Design a protein around this nucleic acid. Structure first.
Ligand SMILES: Nc1nc2c(ncn2[C@@H]2O[C@H](COP(=O)(O)OP(=O)(O)O)[C@@H](O)[C@H]2O)c(=O)[nH]1
Ligand SMILES: [Mg+2]
Ligand SMILES: [Mg+2]
Ligand SMILES: [Mg+2]
Ligand SMILES: [Mg+2]
Ligand SMILES: [Mg+2]
Ligand SMILES: [Mg+2]
Ligand SMILES: [Mg+2]
Lengths: 122, 85, 697, 62
RNA sequence: CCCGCAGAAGAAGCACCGGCUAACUCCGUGCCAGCAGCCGCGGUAAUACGGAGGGUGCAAGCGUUAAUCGGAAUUACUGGGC
RNA sequence: AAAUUGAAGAGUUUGAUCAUGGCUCAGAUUGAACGCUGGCGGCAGGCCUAACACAUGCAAGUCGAACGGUAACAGGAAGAAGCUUGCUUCUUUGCUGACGAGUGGCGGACGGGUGAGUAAUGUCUGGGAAACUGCCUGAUGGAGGGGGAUAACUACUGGAAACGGUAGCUAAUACCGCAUAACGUCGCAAGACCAAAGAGGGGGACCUUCGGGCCUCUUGCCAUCGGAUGUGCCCAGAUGGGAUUAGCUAGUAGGUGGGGUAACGGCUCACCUAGGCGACGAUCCCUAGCUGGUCUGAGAGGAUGACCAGCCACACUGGAACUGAGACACGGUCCAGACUCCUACGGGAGGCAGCAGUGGGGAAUAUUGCACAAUGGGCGCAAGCCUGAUGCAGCCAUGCCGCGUG
């Protein structure tokens, strides 16, 4: 459950280190963002020579939440903290080329095949 | 993982296991001697020293440890035992 | 060596309208299997790297096709697929001379279309022996015979239908051949790769009988003895039919048309067989004409067989994703062998020939040997531009082709970051070498660069190639039109005195200049300074000071800030002060009198007026006429030559900065425009007053 | 830095890549470099016959 | 490497010419266009700019640009001064 | 004998002079670049920048004379069939020649590349004690002697690949014992302890349980003591700039004892002392590989450290170790990090500062060449194999030199 003002972390090597959700895309009055959801982020921190600079606004997809995912068998897969994967603003196409930490089967999509292939688990 | 002389890796791992076993045995016997010394009897320390002295010599002679290492082990141990009683 | 007997090579390319299945067929053509079984050399086939050592799909593929159930030995068929957009038509220009034959693909429902006639003209310029494929028989509303007749009446060709269609849409399962007299229905159900003949199908037997008879008449008119033999009541054998049809197909007689569906994979398997049967070999196509640097015509016919010294033809430089050169080279005669030396005979430059690469079965094979008719590519540093010859030091220097299309759409361009003008300079430098149908400019009104390309899309797929290839972003814009200004019909008799004497060494200058306009372009220099000073009123050693201080203002111009041409000047009367008059006194006094007499001589602002000729199909005459009038342009005669209408109109240049894309919309892509600056005139537009202080106030 | 453009007539502009060498001008206080003509978009002067390697002019073969 | 060579035949250019520095006239320009290593030249006879002739130097190189030492006894230990 | 013989000035401050004083020039040199030209040959040199990222190919293998074996060309056989009467075109055979893969051995730590790091754990000069060294070599002897495994393989099996599982004796110069032992280890002495391995060539009998055995030769192995080589360590002097860096240090500086190394050592640990370095410049900061030497100079010096040779350092970045005589290891391992590439998404793979080469950076620096024929190196008894060392070729007036264009 990611919402506006949520200080996420970054799961890829796009260069950002701490971001913030500034809008949850999809439908009016939408409140929360699930793991699969694409949101809009402002970069609150980055590395000196990273591919992105601090203060940039672009999209992102979530990959880990403390709230966690739920499975059709009822099982819940929670994580230790929130994390996302930055995406280029027009075509999603994650900026980074690496990915840290696990992801979920809820991300095995036609779009995040890249993310799901670069991910060290699930 | 590049050149077929990568069999030196598996060969060296096997030799590492073997040398580790022999080293652990040798130092276990040396620790036998030293604990017997800290306990404070000459006969027990001397027993353990006579039991390790072939071990250290056979290890030096086999290429595991060096002649001088076994030498100074025996030397410091005999000195400790002689002062110990 | 040249084990695949060179006299068997077929060099050909498939050309058609956009989304016509040229790429679908290229892919289908390539189902050659031969994996787990070299099919070649009756040894060493290309099979070693059929093991996929390097995986890639590249242009100009080579292939071995034995035959569709009737087979005759490995042939390396060499294929250059062709694109379909007029935007990028140079890839079809260069890849038509390089070609021996051409498979004119066609949409069985779309028929012949702007690009199909366009590539038809392209091939006619090189007289390429072309046979035609008719793709898309499954789509509803597709009929082979109608498209066949379209060729007969839209291109003025003689479309002999050496095949026939068995059904349409779902019905399509096979094709009635007129020589086998059988209709092979392929085993698409298990795999198209499997095939089967069928004896005399009843559905088309009446239609096939009449159409087959028509084919025999073409075989007959093919040879004079044959014609009389055809009048002997006797039919033709499996060799005189084809050998008669083939022997002139080499010489541009008639285009053979076969139907099929590369989606459902029928018709195609047979199409490959027809290419061997009728399309020319480097030994079947006539020998190439040649020439040296000075000898107006050293005949230089290079016999194709590689017994002449190495003599190739390079047709395309490539931005290889890794190598960075990959200039493809088509060897006509001679043999270069894994390291040799040849010169840029068109450029007068010299370098070696290192790493030939020929990609077959989509595996990028590396070759140390390329021979007669053998299409390949080269990795090197020295540039060889498209259509540039690669002959031996023997040097049949020039090959006749010295032709590239002139850009039809020109657009300005500048980067997003102000410090990538150098990077955008170097990127456009490279992307200008990669295709000759893409100019780059530097006009003198301003340093602004102009990327003049063929079509809207042609230069719209290059604004993003810099984004992709050279990671530089650019923002395009309409080119700035050169606006010069002048006085119009108002003579004025004005005074200008420059004097600042309030110290020891001041300046004094004075002039009375009667500014009157000249006829718009009646004298070469455009300007006119006549001096009517008398009495040595101005010293006279300062008369050229007056001229050099007036024609320096012609560059700037008072009204908006833009050049002044076509005005006369009469230095009626001045005055001087010997101590204070100076060169830079009658330079300034004349300037002042100019820009105070210009504020009252009725200055106007002029615009460039082109001379636009449009080659347009008759029906759309009124349309382009109306759009030329929509633009503030005036028409001057519209003679109608046959198969086009010639429409002249001196349209302003400002009203033409995207014309052709719009014109193509108006003409169904069947017209082009040629414009050339003629004169100047005026139309009320303070848009030039809008652009005064935005840049360089 | 600023640099001198020698010879009679040049075709240099705002965005022209060039090649710069050393050498003061002794006239312009602050111009401590030169522009090698005939190199990197600096065109050789109009048919200079004397001192032709300087100023970058290739030769008439006569 | 050594012999058959018919045949001068396939092979010369670059910088400079005011002083230092060695090599001078004319034309066209007229504090302009331009040169310049330092001093400097060009405002109507310019040995200094541009060109032609001539010469000088070097030559499969020539010239320019770096860059180090020398000259510099201008960091002076040999070998300086207030 | 000769080993050196070596030292120049000019323009410019001024109306002129002297002086002080800077600037410029005359010379030599270069890893050179650029402009214009361009014939040849010889010799040499050719990323000075991004120790930036690297596609592709090759740079470290070898030994059936250590071993189990046997994918082939064969042989030696069993030889079958067609039988041209065994031309044996055909079938079985590790029994040899040889060899795929596998255990084992030696090498892979040499050679090759860069100068990032390092202002001293580096280098040079000269010495010290507390040392160890594969192959090489000189001696002295030894070389009783048991079987407990495991690879290939067989079998099942996992996986796209790397690479595995799970039982079986295999076999060995692989491993561990029991022998036995000293001018060996340790103990002051008394004393105890420590190894090995066999293969090849043939011995007319000199045996035939059918290869005698063991005294036939060559190696191989073990042990100490030397030589030699290589390496480790220590000290003193010299090895840059900066005080617009003056105080720095807590294992720090010493002691004892325990441990540790091949070796002395705060190398380490614990206790004890409070010391130790610093204007002869500690610390801090910047820069830099060092040297023999190259350039210039009469010299003293100034600059420099490209090629060549010695030393050091590093190997995608940080750390660790393992095997080993020698590494804390370019082309090994493990981990972490940054990065990139495959995927049949479950998993993997890599490290050009080797040769060539690509992109890039740059004013600018070469072929993805030939060959192991010498020379050298590794393996081997040796033929032979490998050697991107090396020897040569290619490009480039980049330089020195010779010659040419009459
Ligand atoms: N319906 C139908 N479509 C076809 C047939 N052959 C090709 N196509 C389709 O037309 C499209 C053409 O794409 P492409 O081959 O890139 O066109 P090209 O670039 O001109 O060749 C492809 O998606 C094919 O699916 C056919 O017989 N029937
Ligand atoms: Mg002159
Ligand atoms: Mg003085
Ligand atoms: Mg072998
Ligand atoms: Mg004693
Ligand atoms: Mg020592
Ligand atoms: Mg690197
Ligand atoms: Mg490497």
């Amino acid at each position: 459950m990611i919402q506006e003002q949520t200080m996420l972390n970054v799961a890829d090597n796009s260069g950002a280190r701490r971001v913030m959700c500034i809008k949850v895309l999809g439908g009016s009055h939408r409140r929360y963002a699930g793991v699969g959801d694409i949101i809009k982020i402002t970069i609150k921190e980055a590395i000196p020579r990273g591919k992105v600079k601090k203060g940039d606004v672009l999209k992102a997809v979530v990959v880990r939440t403390k709230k966690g995912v739920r499975r059709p068998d009822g099982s819940v897969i929670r994580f230790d903290g929130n994390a996302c994967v930055l995406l280029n603003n027009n075509s999603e196409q994650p900026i980074g080329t690496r990915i840290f930490g696990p992801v979920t089967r809820e991300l095995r999509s036609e779009k995040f095949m890249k993310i799901i292939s670069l991910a060290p688990e699930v | 993982n590049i050149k077929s002389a990568k069999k030196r890796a598996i060969q060296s791992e096997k030799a590492r296991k073997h040398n580790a076993s022999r080293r652990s045995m040798m130092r276990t016997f040396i620790k036998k001697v030293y604990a017997a010394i800290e306990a404070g009897d000459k006969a027990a320390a001397q027993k353990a020293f006579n039991e390790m002295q072939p071990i250290v010599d056979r290890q030096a002679a086999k290429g595991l440890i060096h002649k001088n290492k076994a030498a100074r082990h025996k030397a410091n141990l005999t000195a400790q035992i002689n002062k110990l009683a | 060596a040249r084990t695949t007997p060179i006299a068997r090579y077929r060099n050909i390319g498939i050309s058609a309208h956009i989304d016509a299945g040229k790429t679908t067929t290229t892919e289908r053509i390539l189902f050659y299997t031969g994996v787990n079984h070299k099919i070649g050399e009756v040894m060493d086939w290309m099979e070693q790297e059929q093991e996929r050592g390097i995986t890639i799909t590249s242009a100009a593929t080579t292939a071995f096709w034995s035959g569709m159930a009737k087979q005759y030995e490995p042939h390396r068929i060499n294929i250059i697929d062709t694109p379909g957009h007029v935007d990028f038509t140079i890839e079809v220009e260069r890849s038509m001379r390089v070609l021996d034959g051409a498979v004119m693909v066609y949409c069985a429902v779309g028929g012949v279309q702007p690009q199909s006639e366009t590539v038809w003209r392209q091939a006619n310029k090189y007289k390429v022996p072309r046979i035609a494929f008719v793709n898309k028989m499954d789509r509803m509303g597709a009929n082979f015979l109608k498209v066949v007749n379209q060729i007969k009446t839209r291109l003025g060709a003689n479309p002999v239908p050496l095949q026939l269609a068995i059904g349409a849409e779902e019905h399509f399962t096979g094709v009635v051949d007129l020589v086998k007299m059988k209709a092979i229905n392929w085993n698409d159900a298990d795999q198209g790769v499997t095939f089967e003949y069928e004896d005399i199908p009843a559905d088309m037997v009446e239609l096939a009988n009449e159409w087959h008879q028509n084919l025999i008449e073409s075989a007959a008119e093919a040879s004079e003895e044959l014609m009389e033999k055809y009048l002997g009541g006797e039919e033709l054998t499996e060799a005189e039919i084809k050998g008669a049809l083939r022997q002139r197909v080499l010489n541009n007689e008639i285009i053979l048309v076969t139907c099929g569906s590369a989606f459902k994979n029928k018709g195609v398997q047979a199409m490959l067989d027809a290419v061997i049967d009728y399309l020319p070999s480097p030994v079947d196509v006539p020998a190439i004409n040649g020439i040296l640097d000075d000898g107006k015509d050293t005949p230089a016919e290079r016999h194709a067989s590689d017994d002449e010294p190495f003599s190739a033809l390079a047709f395309k430089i490539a931005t290889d994703p890794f190598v960075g050169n990959l200039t493809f080279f088509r060897v006509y005669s001679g043999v270069v062998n894994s390291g040799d030396t040849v010169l840029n005979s068109v450029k007068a430059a010299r370098e070696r020939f290192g790493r030939i690469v020929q990609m077959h079965a989509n595996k990028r094979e590396e070759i140390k040997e390329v021979r007669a008719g053998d299409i390949a590519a080269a990795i090197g540093l020295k540039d060889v531009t498209t259509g540039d010859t690669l002959c031996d030091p023997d040097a049949p220097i020039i090959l006749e082709r010295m032709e590239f299309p002139e850009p039809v759409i020109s657009i300005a361009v500048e980067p997003k970051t102000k410090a990538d003008q150098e990077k955008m300079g170097l990127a456009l430098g490279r992307l200008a070498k990669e295709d000759p149908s893409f100019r780059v400019w530097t006009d003198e009104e301003s340093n602004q660069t102009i990327i003049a390309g063929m079509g809207e899309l042609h230069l719209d797929i290059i604004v993003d190639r810099m984004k992709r290839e050279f990671n530089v972003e650019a923002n395009v814009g309409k080119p700035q039109v050169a606006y010069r200004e002048t006085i119009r019909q108002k003579v004025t008799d004005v005074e200008g005195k420059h004097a600042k004497q309030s110290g020891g060494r001041g300046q004094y200058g004075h002039v009375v200049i009667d500014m009157y306009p000249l006829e718009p372009g009646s004298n070469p220099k455009g300007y006119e300074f006549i001096n009517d000073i008398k009495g040595g009123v101005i010293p006279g050693e300062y008369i050229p000071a007056v001229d050099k201080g007036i024609q320096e203002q012609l560059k700037a111009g008072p009204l908006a800030g833009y050049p002044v041409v076509d005005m006369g000047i009469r230095l009626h009367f001045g005055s001087y002060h010997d101590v204070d008059s100076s060169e830079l006194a009658f330079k300034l006094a004349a300037s002042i009198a100019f820009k105070e007499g210009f504020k009252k001589a009725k200055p106007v602002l002029l615009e460039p007026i082109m001379k636009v000729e449009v080659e347009t199909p008759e029906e759309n005459t009124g349309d382009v006429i109306g759009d030329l009038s929509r633009r503030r342009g005036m028409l001057k005669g519209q003679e109608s030559e046959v198969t086009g209408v010639k429409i002249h109109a001196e349209v302003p240049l400002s009203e033409m900065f995207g014309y052709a894309t719009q014109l193509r919309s108006l003409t169904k892509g069947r017209a082009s425009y040629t414009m050339e600056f003629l004169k100047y005139d005026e139309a009320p537009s303070n848009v030039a007053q809008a652009v005064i202080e935005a840049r360089g106030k | 830095v600023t640099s001198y453009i020698g010879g009679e007539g040049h075709n240099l502009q705002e965005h022209s890549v060039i090649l710069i060498r050393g050498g003061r001008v002794k006239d312009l206080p602050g111009v401590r470099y030169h522009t090698v003509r005939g190199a990197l978009d600096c065109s050789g002067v109009k048919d200079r016959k004397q001192a032709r390697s300087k100023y970058g002019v290739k030769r008439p073969k006569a």
